[PDB]
Amino acid sequence: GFGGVEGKDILVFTRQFATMIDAGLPLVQCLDILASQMDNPSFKKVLFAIKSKVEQGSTFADALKEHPKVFDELYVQLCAAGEVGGILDAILNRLAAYREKNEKLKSKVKSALVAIGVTAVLLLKVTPVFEKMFADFGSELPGPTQMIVNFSHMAQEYFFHVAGSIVAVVMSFTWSYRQPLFMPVFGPVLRKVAVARFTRTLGTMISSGVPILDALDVTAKTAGNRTVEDAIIYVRGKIAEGKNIAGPLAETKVFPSMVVQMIGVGEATGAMDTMLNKIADFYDDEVDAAAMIEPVLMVFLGGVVGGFLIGMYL
Amino acid sequence: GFGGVEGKDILVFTRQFATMIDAGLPLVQCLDILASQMDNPSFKKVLFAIKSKVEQGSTFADALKEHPKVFDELYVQLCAAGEVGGILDAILNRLAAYREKNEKLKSKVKSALVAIGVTAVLLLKVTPVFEKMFADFGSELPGPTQMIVNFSHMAQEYFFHVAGSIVAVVMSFTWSYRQPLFMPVFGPVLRKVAVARFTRTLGTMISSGVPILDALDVTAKTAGNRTVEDAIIYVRGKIAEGKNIAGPLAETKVFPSMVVQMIGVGEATGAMDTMLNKIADFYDDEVDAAAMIEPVLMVFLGGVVGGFLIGMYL
Amino acid sequence: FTLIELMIVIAIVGILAAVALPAYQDYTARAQVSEAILLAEGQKSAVTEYYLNHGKWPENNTSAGVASSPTDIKGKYVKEVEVKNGVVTATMLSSGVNNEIKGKKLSLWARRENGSVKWFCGQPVTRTDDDTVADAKDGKEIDTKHLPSTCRDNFDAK
Amino acid sequence: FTLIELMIVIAIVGILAAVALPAYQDYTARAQVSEAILLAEGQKSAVTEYYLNHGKWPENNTSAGVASSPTDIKGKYVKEVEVKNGVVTATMLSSGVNNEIKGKKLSLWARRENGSVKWFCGQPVTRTDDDTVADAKDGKEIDTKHLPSTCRDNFDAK
Lengths: 314, 314, 158, 158
Description:
This is part of a larger assembly, with 2 copies of chain A (about 325 residues) and 2 copies of chain C (about 160 residues). With about 325 residues, chain A is an all-alpha fold.
């Protein structure tokens, strides 16, 4: 018996492979880099073993088959479908987006059938069960009827409470579904997520040995947010013209003073790889902290429960 | 009407004065340095004005009196008590520790009625509500009584469950209050805080113009953690013998590969001041952000809930 | 950083007890008085018979044919019950009762209906003549708030 | 963040009073009617004797030899008791009673057994002949729900 790896940790590693492979590095060199940039041993250890099979000439799909407890049949088949069709790059991008959506969805049920499914049944009916069970403590409560009425009339009068229960359900479903003119002012710009991804990708390609300009040309093709893609094309154009990396960044609001000042050190130090790796880890942890997706649950959780109980009493 | 300054910003500045004054720099030169190293204008601006009074010959206590909205009566009196008794150095160290405890205590109530208050009620009773909900689903559960007993006996037998609920509460309160044989292995070593303080102190004395070795001799007397003091005495001893600063650091785990690589660039560039200032501000921001403070919550969260449910079951 | 759910819920049960304190404290007193009333009654029989058979109100317990000793008609909250000229007064003990009702009392008295009598229940009264009583005004009467709706009778109720 | 134990427990006692409200309100009314019945009875004696001695039902209170004035046979919840041809009706006061029973009444009537009579208790009735009465149908009868199991008699009960 062996377990997989965390949702976070699959995420980081699938993202960073998709990024390196779409950069045109050799698959074995992609594998080496993410292993060598890893913080947990179990990841660095596996990825050396996956790479060891790839250097014997096996496909990535067949190399991941050595860890079926970590990469399930659906993951390998996605890889292998990409390898068979000549689309390994775009299926890894798909898998990275998949792993990101999976981790975010995990944090965000749990915060405040897997665990998400069992916890989501369990939260969706907790209250409405409470409710039915206070309303089953005997007869002649607030709002009931006597049991001798005809059933249809008894059930229709309680319709109030059947309704307050369904509304309670709809609410906890909404919290679980949501929760996992200046025209340019209205466009979605770069977020925290998109800066964290950028920084990880660049930290990744620099630590591997790619120059800054080669890493930026790859990244400018793999950036999801259009306004950031436009930002990064401008940063790369500025750097390729001979402007200093920290100065192309300083023109764009999305990079704080600390980010620019830290990058500006990294330029003079030949340590940009790592400046970016520490920036990226800082951002990835700020991202996963960012907490209102769990407090607003609980607001609607007990607020609806209490609204039911109040409802019939009155 | 004028406001004070932030808890963070009093902190940084009281620390860095205590550090410079305990170094034996002249008080006016201490004042100049922290003003000249400041990032906010309002701080650099005041500290030029406090220094302007000190160069007219006034005490630091009487110079801070020009900003009574920033340095309260209790702060000045501590300074003035230090100045009257010949202990200005040790009362500034006390004030720096005070300001650090004040900022940390501020972040840490406020963090998460705001959102923290609403989320903390909401987490503290979630479980104990679930619990009362499953135990209100009728009669003749695990451990109950029949309703016809006398109330006092019924309530006393359940005392088990009333107790398992309170314990559940105490636990989630502990996680919210805390959280905001190899004998040497058991000693508290250097933390993030202690590295951030060290780096700020050194960034501070180098930017002011002190050499590395003069700054290390002061710092080795003002380091609070004993194991770090022992580390820093070894770093200073190595440097004074003619070993290169990055090489004395590289022997000690508390300095990452990059802190060392960055310091190693600073040695060859004559920019150790700039390097240390940016290292320190990176660390100070990592400190105030700060991942095990959230995983251990959840351990006690569901672990206590489950302990209750099992408790009456049996 | 965290633990406020345990701190607030221990402090809402604390204030819940403070709000439930005066409710249980008059419900409680009102309960201890309802007995002084039951101990006072059931002695109406003796008094009624004595009056109808003789046409004069029983002067004291012995006359009424009841525990010759007032203190022998006590209870948990009742320190006694004395018959004074047909008027039966019940005294509240000093131990085991509210706080503003101990050592306090009420009275039951009757009136000639001619062939029968009618009983009243209320705050302490003294008998003047065979068909008239008056407030035993003195300061030891059980406060109106502690008396049932059935025991709000005035000295001149008819 | 915290305080819901005080808020819910103050709101469960509030709703507990609302559930305990109708129980105390019919237990209460049912109690106020049980007396109209006691005031009605004890007047059976006069009526019985009058009938057995004369063979005719007493026309009114005075005939039956009772407080010549109906209003003189009142109570706390009883506004009076009138004897109308052997039928004794009790009226519920307007003050101090439930709400759906005030100004409402019941009747006690008897029937010749020949040598003796048997009494009935139920909703208001009128006497037709010496051995027959009928529903005093008019809308002021105390509702069946407020009447004891011993006072559910119909106009033609034998």
